[PDB]
């Protein structure tokens, strides 16, 4: 892989993917709470020479559409910068972030990757076809 | 919703969703590690008059194809029993499970729901969709 777009909740797992595949371009989508992790990923990637796009923030992380659109923007920005082999690692983030990222990646025809290792609750809809 | 298919990791969350939706039909997909929790959801549901299908087991919880196919089996199974407005609740279980359940629900035309509330010594990178 030439490029990788990450949904981010922790910094350690994207770093390990970086070493595995050594891409030339990287995109980062985070929430407000996970922004510091995304910036930590960006900092190590910059000093290895990777071109870093983002982090982009999603206003509501429980809304898959928000994540989907941000990953879409980054997948386009990376294609523009001249990257042709892009994948989306959706390991990080809450479930709707990973789901929105997968949606963006299916909709652009790119490969999705994964790293195998109640009073507040609302019921929400992810998809209605 | 009159039918809900659940991916199961814990027993609490599905129970909570059951109380909110009051479904008539239920489907249950579990891993080996979560089969007991699913059986406990199933026991509670059958005593409330709910027709329960499963729990089915997925052998590889990291393979989304194995989750997709069990959820898809259960959705067709529920429809043949007379259920027709079904939602897939895909909280519970790891990401691959949830994504497999999302794939099966999209291909079946059903809505997907979600309840809104690490050691790197050994890791494998898997491709989950290769379009």
Residue numbers in the entry:
A (entry chain B): 67 to 183, 194 to 205
B (entry chain A): 67 to 183, 192 to 205
Provide text from the study.
Prokaryotic type III CRISPR–Cas systems provide immunity against viruses and plasmids using CRISPR-associated Rossman fold (CARF) protein effectors. We studied WP_013033759 (hereafter named Cam1) from the halophilic Gram-negative chromatiaceae Nitrosococcus halophilus Nc4, which contains a CARF domain fused to a transmembrane domain that does not seem to be capable of degrading nucleic acids, as is the case for all the previously characterized CARF effectors. N. halophilus Cam1 (hereafter NhCam1) has a molecular mass of 22.3 kDa and contains 206 amino acids, with an N-terminal transmembrane helix (TMH) predicted to be 24 amino acids in length by deepTMHMM26 followed by an equally short linker (L1) and a C-terminal intracellular CARF domain.
We next grew crystals and solved the structure NhCam1-CARF (residues 42–206) in the absence and presence of bound cA4. Loop L2 connects β6 and β7 in one monomer, but this loop is disordered in the other monomer; loop L1 is disordered in both monomers of the CARF dimer. We identified 56 different Cam1 homologues, which we used to perform a MUSCLE protein sequence alignment, finding that D17, but not S24, is highly conserved. Notably, the apo NhCam1-CARF dimer crystal structure aligned to the CARF domain of the model with a root mean-squared deviation of 0.44 Å.
